[PDB]
Structure formats: C-alpha cells, structure tokens
mmCIF file of C-alpha atoms in Angstrom:
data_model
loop_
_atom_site.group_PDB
_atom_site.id
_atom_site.type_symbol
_atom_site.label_atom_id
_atom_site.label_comp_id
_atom_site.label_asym_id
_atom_site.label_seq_id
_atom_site.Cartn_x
_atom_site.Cartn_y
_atom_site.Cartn_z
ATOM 1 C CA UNK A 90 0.000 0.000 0.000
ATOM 2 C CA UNK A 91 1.344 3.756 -0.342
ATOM 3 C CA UNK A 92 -0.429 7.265 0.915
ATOM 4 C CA UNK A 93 0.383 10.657 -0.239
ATOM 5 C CA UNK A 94 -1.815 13.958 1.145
ATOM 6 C CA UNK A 95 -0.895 17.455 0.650
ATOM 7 C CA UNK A 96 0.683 19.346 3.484
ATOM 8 C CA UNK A 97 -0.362 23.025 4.030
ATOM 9 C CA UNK A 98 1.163 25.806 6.084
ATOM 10 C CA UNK A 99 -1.129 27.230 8.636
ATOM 11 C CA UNK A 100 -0.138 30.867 7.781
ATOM 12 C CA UNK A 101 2.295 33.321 5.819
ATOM 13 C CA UNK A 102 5.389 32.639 7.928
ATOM 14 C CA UNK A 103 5.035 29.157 7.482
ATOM 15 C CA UNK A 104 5.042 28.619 11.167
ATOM 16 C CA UNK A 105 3.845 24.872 10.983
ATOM 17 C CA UNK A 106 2.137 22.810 8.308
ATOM 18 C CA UNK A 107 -0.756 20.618 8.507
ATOM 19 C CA UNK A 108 -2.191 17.913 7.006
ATOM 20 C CA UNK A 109 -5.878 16.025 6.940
ATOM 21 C CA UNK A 110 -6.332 12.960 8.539
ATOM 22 C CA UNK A 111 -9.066 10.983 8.781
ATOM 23 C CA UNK A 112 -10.345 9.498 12.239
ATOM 24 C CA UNK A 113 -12.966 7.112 12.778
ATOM 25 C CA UNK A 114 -16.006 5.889 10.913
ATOM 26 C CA UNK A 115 -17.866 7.499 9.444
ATOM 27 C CA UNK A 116 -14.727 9.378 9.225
ATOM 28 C CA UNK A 117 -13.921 12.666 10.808
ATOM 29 C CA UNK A 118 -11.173 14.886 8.863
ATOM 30 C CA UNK A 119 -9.035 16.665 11.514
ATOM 31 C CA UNK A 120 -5.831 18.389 10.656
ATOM 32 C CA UNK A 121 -2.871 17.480 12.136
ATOM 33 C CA UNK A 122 0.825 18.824 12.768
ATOM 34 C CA UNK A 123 2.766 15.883 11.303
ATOM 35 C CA UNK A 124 6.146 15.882 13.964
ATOM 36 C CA UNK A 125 9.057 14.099 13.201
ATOM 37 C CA UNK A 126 10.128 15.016 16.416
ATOM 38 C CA UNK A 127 7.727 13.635 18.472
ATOM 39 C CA UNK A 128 5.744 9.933 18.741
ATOM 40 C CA UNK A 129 1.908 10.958 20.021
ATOM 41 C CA UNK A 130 -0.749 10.976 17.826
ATOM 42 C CA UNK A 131 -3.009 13.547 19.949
ATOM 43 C CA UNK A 132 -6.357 15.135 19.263
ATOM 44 C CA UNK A 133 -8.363 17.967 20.518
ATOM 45 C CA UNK A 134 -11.793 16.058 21.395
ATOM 46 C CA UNK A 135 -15.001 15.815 22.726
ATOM 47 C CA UNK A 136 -12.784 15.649 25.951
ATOM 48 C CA UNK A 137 -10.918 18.681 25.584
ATOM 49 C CA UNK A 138 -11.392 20.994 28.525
ATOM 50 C CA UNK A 139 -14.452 23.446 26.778
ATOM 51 C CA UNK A 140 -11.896 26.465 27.943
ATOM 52 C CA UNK A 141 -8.961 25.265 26.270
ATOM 53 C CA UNK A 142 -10.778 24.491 22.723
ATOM 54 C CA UNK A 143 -10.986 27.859 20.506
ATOM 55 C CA UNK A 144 -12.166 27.172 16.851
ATOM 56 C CA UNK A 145 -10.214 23.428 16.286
ATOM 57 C CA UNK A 146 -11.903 20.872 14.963
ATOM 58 C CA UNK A 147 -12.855 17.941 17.254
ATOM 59 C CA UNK A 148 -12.763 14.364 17.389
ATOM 60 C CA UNK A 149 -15.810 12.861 18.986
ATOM 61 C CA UNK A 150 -15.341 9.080 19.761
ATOM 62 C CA UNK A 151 -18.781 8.659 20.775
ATOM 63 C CA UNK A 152 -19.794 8.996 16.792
ATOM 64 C CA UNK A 153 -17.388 6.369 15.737
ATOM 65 C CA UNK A 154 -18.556 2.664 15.139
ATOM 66 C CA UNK A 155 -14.871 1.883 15.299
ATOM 67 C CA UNK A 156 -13.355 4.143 18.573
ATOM 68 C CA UNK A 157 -12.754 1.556 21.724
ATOM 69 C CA UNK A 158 -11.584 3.013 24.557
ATOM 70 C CA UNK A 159 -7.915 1.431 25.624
ATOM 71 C CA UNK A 160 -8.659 0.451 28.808
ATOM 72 C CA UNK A 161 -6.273 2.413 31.752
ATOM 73 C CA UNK A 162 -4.079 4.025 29.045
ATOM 74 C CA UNK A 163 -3.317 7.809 29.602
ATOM 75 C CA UNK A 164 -0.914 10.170 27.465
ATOM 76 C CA UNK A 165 0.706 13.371 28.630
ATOM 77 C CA UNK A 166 3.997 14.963 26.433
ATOM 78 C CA UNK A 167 5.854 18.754 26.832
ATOM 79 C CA UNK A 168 7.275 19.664 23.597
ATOM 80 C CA UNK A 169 10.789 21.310 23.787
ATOM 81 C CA UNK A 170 9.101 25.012 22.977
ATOM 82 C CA UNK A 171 6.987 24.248 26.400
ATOM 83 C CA UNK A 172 3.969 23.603 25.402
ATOM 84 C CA UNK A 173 2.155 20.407 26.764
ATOM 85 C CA UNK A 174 -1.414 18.379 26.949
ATOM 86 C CA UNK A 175 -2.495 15.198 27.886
ATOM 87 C CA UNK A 176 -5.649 12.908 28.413
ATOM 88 C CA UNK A 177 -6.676 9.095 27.530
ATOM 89 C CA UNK A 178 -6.798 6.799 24.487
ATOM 90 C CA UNK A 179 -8.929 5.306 22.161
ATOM 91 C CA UNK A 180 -8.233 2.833 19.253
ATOM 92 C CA UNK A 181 -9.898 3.704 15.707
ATOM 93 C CA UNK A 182 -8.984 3.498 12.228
ATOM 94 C CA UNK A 183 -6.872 6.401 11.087
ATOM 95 C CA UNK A 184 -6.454 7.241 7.409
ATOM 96 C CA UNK A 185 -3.922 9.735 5.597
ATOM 97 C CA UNK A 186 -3.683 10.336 1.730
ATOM 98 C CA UNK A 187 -5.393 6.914 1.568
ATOM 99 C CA UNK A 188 -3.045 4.826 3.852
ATOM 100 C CA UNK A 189 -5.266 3.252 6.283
ATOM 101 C CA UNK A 190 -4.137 2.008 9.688
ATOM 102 C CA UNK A 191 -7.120 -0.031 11.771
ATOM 103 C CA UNK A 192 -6.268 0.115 15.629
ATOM 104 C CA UNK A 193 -4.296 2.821 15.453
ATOM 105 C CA UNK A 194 -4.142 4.455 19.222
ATOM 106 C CA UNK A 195 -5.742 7.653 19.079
ATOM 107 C CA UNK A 196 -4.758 9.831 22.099
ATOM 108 C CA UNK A 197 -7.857 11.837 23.105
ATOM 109 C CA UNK A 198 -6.846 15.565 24.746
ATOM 110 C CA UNK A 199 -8.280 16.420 28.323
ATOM 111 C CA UNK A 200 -6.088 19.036 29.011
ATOM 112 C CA UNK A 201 -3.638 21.345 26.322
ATOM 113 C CA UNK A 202 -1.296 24.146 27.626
ATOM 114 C CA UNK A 203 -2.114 27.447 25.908
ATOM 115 C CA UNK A 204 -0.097 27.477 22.890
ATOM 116 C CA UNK A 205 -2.371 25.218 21.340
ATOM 117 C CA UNK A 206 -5.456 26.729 22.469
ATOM 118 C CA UNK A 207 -4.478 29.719 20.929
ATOM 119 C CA UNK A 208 -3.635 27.938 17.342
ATOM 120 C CA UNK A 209 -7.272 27.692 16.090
ATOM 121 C CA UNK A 210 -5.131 26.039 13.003
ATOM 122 C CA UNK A 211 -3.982 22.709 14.351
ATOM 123 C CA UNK A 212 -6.313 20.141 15.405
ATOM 124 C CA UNK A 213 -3.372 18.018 17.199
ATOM 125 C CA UNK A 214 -0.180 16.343 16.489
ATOM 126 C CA UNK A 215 0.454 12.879 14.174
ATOM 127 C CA UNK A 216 3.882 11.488 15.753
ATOM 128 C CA UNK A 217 6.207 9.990 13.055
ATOM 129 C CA UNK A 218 9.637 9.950 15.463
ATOM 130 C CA UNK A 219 10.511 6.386 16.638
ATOM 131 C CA UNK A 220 7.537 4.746 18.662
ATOM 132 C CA UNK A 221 10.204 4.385 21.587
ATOM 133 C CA UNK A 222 9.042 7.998 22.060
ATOM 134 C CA UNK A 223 5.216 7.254 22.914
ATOM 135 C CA UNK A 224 3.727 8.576 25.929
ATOM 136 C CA UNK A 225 1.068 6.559 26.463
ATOM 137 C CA UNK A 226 0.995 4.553 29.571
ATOM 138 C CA UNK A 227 0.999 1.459 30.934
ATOM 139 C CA UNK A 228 1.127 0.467 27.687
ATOM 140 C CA UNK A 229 3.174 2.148 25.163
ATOM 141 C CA UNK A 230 1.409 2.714 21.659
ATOM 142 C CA UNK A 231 2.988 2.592 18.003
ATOM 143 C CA UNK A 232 2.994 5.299 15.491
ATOM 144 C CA UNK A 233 0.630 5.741 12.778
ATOM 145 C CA UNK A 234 3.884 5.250 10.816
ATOM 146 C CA UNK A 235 5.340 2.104 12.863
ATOM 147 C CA UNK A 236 1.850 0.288 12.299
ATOM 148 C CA UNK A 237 1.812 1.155 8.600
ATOM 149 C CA UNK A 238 5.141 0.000 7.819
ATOM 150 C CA UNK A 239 4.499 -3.524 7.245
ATOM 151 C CA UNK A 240 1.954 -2.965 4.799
ATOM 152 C CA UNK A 241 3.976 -0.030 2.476
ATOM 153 C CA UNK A 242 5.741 -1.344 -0.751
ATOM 154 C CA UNK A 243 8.811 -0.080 0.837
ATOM 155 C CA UNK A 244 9.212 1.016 4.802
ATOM 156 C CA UNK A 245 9.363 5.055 4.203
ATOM 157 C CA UNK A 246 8.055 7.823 4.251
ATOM 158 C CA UNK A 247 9.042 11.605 2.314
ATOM 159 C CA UNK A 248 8.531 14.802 3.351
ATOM 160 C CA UNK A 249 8.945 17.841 0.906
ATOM 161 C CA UNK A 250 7.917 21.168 2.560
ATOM 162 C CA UNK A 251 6.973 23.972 0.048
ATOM 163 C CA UNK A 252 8.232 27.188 1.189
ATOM 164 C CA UNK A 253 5.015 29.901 1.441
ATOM 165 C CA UNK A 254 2.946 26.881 -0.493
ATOM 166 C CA UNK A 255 1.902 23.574 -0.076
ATOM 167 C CA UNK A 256 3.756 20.232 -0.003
ATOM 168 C CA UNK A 257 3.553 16.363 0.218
ATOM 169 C CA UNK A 258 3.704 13.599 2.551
ATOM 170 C CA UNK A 259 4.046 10.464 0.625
ATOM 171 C CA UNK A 260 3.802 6.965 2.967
ATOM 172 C CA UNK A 261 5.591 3.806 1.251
ATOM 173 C CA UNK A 262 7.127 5.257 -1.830
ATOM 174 C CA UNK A 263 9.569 7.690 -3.402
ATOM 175 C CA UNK A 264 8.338 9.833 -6.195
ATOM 176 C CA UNK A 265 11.181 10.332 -8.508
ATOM 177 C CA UNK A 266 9.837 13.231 -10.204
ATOM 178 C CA UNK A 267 9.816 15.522 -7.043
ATOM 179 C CA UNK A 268 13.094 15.907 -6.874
ATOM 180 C CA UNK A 269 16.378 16.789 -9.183
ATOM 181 C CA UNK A 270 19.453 15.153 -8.555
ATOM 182 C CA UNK A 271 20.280 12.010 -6.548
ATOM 183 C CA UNK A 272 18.912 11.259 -3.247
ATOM 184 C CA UNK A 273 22.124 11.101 -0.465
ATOM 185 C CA UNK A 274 21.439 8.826 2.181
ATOM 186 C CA UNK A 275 22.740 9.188 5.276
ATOM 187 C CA UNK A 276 23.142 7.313 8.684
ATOM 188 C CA UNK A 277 20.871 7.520 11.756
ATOM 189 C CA UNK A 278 20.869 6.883 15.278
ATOM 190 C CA UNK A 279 17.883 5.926 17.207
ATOM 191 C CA UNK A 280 19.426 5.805 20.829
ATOM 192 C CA UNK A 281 17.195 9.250 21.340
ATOM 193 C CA UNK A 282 13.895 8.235 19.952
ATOM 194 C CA UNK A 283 14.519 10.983 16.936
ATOM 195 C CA UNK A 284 16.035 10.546 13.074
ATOM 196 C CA UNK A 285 19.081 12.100 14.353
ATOM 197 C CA UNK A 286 22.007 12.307 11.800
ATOM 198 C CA UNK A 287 25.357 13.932 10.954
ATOM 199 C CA UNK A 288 25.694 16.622 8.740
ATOM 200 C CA UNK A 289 29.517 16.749 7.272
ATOM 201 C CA UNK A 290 29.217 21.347 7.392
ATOM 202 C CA UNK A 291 27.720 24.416 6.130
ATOM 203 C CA UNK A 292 28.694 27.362 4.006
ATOM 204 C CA UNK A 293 27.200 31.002 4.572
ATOM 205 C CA UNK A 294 26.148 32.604 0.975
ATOM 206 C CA UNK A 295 28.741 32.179 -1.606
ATOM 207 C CA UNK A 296 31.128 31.713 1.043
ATOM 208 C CA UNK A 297 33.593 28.669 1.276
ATOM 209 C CA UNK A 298 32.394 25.314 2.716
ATOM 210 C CA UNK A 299 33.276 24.440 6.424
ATOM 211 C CA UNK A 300 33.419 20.543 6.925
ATOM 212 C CA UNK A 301 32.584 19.747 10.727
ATOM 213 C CA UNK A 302 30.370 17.217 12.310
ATOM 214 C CA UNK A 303 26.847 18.594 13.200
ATOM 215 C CA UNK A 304 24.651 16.203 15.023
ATOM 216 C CA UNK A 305 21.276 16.770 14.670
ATOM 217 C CA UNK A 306 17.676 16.035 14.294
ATOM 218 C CA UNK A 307 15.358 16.234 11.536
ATOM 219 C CA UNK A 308 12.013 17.482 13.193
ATOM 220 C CA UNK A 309 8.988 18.365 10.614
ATOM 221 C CA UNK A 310 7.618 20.280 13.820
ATOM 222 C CA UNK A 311 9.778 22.671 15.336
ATOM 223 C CA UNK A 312 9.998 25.575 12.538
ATOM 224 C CA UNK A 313 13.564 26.960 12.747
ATOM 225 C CA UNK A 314 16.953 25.720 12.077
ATOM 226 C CA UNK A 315 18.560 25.760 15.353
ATOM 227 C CA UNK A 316 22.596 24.845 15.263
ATOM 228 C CA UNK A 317 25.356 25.413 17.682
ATOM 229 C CA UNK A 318 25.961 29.127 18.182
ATOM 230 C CA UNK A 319 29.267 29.592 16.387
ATOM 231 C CA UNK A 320 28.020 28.524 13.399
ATOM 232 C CA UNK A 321 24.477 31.293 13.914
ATOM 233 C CA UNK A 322 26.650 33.753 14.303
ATOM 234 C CA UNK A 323 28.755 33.650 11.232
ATOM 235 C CA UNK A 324 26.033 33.442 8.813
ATOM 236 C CA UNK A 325 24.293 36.568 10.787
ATOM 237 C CA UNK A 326 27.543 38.266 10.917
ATOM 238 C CA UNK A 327 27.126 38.401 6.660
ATOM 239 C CA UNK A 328 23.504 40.383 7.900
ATOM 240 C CA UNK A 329 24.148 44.222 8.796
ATOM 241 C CA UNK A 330 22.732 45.101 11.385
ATOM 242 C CA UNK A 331 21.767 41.808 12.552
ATOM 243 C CA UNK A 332 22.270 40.583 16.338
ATOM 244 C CA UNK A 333 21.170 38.309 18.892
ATOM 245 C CA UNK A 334 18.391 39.999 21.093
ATOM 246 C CA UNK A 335 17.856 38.971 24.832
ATOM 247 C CA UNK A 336 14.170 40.597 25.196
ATOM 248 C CA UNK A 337 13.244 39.038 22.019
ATOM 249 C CA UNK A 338 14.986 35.338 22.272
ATOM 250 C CA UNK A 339 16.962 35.256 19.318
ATOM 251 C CA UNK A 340 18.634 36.698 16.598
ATOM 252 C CA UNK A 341 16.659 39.836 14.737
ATOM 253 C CA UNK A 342 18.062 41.718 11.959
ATOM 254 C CA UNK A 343 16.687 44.956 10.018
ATOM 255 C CA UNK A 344 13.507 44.287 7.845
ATOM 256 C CA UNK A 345 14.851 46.280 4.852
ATOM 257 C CA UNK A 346 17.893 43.490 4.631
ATOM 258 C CA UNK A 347 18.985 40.436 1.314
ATOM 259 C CA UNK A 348 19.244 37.437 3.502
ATOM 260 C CA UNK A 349 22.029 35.128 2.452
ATOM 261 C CA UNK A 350 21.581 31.861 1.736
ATOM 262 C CA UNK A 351 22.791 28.813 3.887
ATOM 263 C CA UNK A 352 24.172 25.662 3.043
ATOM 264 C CA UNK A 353 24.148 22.461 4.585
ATOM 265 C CA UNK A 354 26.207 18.886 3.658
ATOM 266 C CA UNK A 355 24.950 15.738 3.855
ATOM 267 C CA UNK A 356 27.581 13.583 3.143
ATOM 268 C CA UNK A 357 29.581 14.773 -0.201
ATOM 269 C CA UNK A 358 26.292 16.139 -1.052
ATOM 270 C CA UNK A 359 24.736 20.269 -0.474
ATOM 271 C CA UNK A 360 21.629 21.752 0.039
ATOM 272 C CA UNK A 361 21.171 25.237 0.103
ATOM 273 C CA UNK A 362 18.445 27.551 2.181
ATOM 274 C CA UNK A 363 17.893 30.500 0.051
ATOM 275 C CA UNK A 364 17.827 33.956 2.014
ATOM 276 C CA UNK A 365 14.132 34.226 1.697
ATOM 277 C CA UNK A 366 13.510 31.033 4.082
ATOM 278 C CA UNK A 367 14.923 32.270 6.776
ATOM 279 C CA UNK A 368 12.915 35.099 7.052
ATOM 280 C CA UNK A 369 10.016 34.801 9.883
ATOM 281 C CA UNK A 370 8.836 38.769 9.376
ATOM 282 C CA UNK A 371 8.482 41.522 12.095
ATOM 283 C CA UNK A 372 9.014 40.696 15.370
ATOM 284 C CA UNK A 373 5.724 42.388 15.949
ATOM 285 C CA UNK A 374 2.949 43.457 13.890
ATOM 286 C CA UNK A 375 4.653 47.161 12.626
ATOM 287 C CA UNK A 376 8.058 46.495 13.337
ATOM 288 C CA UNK A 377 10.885 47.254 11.371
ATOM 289 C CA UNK A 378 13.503 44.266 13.073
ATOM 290 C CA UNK A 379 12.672 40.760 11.922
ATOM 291 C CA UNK A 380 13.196 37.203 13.817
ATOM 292 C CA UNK A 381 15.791 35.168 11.808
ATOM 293 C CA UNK A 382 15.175 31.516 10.993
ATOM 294 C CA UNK A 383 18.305 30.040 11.978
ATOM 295 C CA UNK A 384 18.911 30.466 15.414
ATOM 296 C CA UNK A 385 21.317 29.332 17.738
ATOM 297 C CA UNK A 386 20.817 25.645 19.982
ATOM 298 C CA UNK A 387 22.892 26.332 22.806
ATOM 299 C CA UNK A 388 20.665 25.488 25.612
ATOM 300 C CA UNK A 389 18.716 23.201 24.011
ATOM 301 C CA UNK A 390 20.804 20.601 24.225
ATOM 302 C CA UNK A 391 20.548 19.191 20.762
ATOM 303 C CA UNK A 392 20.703 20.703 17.072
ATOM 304 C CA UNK A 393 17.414 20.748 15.096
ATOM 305 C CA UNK A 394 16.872 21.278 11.763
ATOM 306 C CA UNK A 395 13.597 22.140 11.280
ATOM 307 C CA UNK A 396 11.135 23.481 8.935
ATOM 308 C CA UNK A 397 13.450 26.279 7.486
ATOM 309 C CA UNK A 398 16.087 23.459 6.606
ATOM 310 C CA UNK A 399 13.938 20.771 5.824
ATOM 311 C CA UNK A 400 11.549 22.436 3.268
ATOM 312 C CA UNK A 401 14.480 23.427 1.446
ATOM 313 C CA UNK A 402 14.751 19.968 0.565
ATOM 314 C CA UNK A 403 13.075 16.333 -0.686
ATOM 315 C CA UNK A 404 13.576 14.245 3.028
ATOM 316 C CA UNK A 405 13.470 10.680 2.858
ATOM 317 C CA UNK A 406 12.719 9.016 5.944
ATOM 318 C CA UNK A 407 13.864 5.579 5.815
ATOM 319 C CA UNK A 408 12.279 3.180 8.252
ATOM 320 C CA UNK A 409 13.958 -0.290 7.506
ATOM 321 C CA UNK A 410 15.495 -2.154 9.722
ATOM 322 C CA UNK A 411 18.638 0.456 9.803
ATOM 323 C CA UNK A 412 16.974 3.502 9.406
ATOM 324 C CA UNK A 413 18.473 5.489 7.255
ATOM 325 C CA UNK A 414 17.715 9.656 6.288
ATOM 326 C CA UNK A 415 17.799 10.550 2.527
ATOM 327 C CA UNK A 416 18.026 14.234 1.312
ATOM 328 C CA UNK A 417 17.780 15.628 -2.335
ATOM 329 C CA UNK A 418 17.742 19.417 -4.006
ATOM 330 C CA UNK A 419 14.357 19.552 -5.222
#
C-alpha cells in the first residue's frame, strides 16, 4: 500500500504545516501537525477541557462505530518550545492520503497548555519519530507510521515542505519526479527516539564550505533551524545590522535586509536555504527588526533542523530495519 496527502502551512510565515487525517467511521477529517520530532498521535476532542478548545476541529469518539476506549491508558507529552497536553486513548482506524491504519491508538486531549489553544489552526499532532518515544501509559502505543510500515511497498516515508505553499507527505514510496538530482542517504541513530544524523558542514552565501560534524535532528515540527551558536553567528555576521536579542529570544536583523543563503552537507552532497527562508517577518505586527530563521541551539541541548532546513529539501525518511535519512535538491 502507499499514501500521499498534501501538506499546508497554517499561515504566511510558514510557522507549521498541517495535514488532513481521517479518524474514525464514518470518518472525521481533523488536521494534524505531522512531527518528526515527536511519537503521540493527539487530538483535541469531545474531551478537551471546553476552555482550552478555541475554533479546532474535534474528534468525537462517541460517533465512531470503530473508537474503543484502551482500557487504563493515559498520554501526557511537553514539547521542547513548552507547550504540553495530555488525556486518555482510544483505538480507531486512522487514514492519511489513503493509507489506512485499523487500531491505530488515538490519544484523546483532556487538558492542552495554551499554545495550542491559541492555534485555532492545528487540530493536534500525528507522531512519526521512533515509537520508543510514545507517551502513552501502561502500555506504550505505536505510530501511525510504525503500524503502517508492514503494509507499504517499501518502509518510508518523504517529506517535501513547500516554502510559502503547499507540499507532500508520501507513505511507502519515493516519487522520482519531485526531486532533481540524486537522493544522499545518510546514517541515523535511534538511541534518542529521533532521526538524528550527521551533517559533514555548512557554508554562509557564496562563502567557502566548512566541513565539521553537526549532530542533529530532523524534526517536521519545530519551525527553525537551530545549530550550535558559532556557526548562527557567522552566517548573521554576513547580515548588517543583525544581532542576537535577549528581550526578544533570538537573533533579529533589520527588515529592509537580502538574507544570504545557507548551506548544509549531507555527506559529499549540499543543500542550500535561500535567504528568503529564513525570514520569519516583524518581530511584531509594525516592526521594522525581523526574527531570523536560523537560530542558535545552545541550551537546548541538541541541534534541530527544522522546517526552514527541511523544506528546502526532498527528506526521505527511511524506516527499515537500519533507518536510514535521505536528502535531495528539489
């Protein structure tokens, strides 16, 4: 079997992208944050705290022939940006782009911390990190991905971002046509739950290539390119005017300024960020100084490259027995 469904940014900046997924039966088409940093599949519900809902779309389990409660099984996850929720679990059949999983755990929201609240946008998260990750206790649950696998013509998954336009998740196949080049695999390492891989370096504009190691994670759900702080500051040292701001949490630079592009290796391989991606617009509505997307990791504790990296790119995730990442120029 294969699935592919169109992936959609929730807004201008490109903050986040979702994608429609169908729960239950008949179904009910919620739209999800697909996180390759993360190993919940989460709704907002019939459950959801009336307060903490504000314009989502709900899942109702009570309308599905197919939702069984899971018997004792409660979920609760904080994201690295803070932001939290939790609540109990249901089986049902979950479909995307076609792919249909039957049991699939469904983790029903009680309670969400207010950054989702506030995100009328996204209807919950779909979890496609490694199912070592799951929340759900006594008995941890698979990903939509994990319990798909076996079925797919081939054990992968693709993501290919637009930048300021839609995109595709394809499940179980590589379409050869969406990208130009070769695809360069590279290794992963599951020891942290994530698709966590080396990059071999980076080069700032049409500057010369650095080769150094730069562990990392490829995470569909955190926006930003976040990488160890010597390497931020020499591409926004190429910005005038640019600098790190305290008050605001990152670097800013002047509205009015050509962003230069940024390269990252993978292997022997390249693939460049233009200027535009990285930037996320006025710090505040009327501002002249805008947030940069590449920002620094240091107290994060691990290198992410994010939306601003990853859209910039056809992403193969590789889910065979040694998972492997694959990244092409597109």
């Amino acid at each position: 079997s294969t699935g592919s469904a169109t992936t959609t940014p929730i807004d201008s900046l490109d903050d986040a992208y979702i994608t429609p997924v169908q729960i239950g039966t008949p179904a009910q088409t919620l739209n999800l944050d697909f996180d390759t940093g993360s190993s919940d599949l989460w709704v907002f519900s019939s459950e959801t705290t009336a307060s903490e809902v504000d314009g989502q779309t709900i899942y109702t389990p009570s309308k599905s022939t197919t939702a069984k409660l899971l018997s004792g099984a409660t979920w609760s996850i904080s994201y690295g940006d803070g932001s939290s929720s939790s609540g109990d679990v249901y089986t049902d059949t979950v479909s995307v782009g076609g792919l249909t999983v039957t049991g699939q755990a469904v983790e029903s929201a009680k309670k969400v911390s207010s950054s989702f609240t506030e995100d009328s946008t996204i209807d919950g998260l779909l979890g496609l990190a490694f199912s070592t990750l799951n929340t759900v206790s006594p008995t941890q649950q698979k990903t939509f991905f994990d319990n798909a696998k076996a079925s797919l013509d081939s054990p992968v998954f693709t993501a290919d971002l637009g930048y300021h336009a839609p995109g595709t998740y394809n499940f179980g196949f590589i379409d050869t046509t969406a990208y130009t080049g070769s695809i360069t695999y590279t290794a992963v390492s599951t020891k942290q739950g994530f698709w966590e891989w080396t990059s071999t370096g980076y080069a700032v504009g049409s500057g010369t290539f650095k080769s150094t190691s730069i562990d990392g994670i490829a995470d569909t759900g955190t926006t930003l390119l976040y990488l160890p702080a010597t390497v931020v500051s020499a591409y926004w040292a190429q910005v005038s005017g640019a600098k790190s701001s305290s008050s605001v949490g990152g670097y800013v630079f002047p509205c009015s300024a050509t962003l230069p592009s940024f390269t990252f290796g993978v292997g022997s391989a390249r693939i460049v960020i233009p200027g535009d991606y990285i930037d996320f617009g006025p710090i505040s509505t009327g501002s002249s100084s805008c947030f940069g997307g590449i920002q620094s990791s240091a107290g994060i504790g691990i290198n992410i490259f994010g939306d601003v990296a990853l859209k910039a790119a056809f992403v193969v995730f590789n889910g065979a027995t040694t998972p492997t990442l694959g990244f092409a120029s597109k």
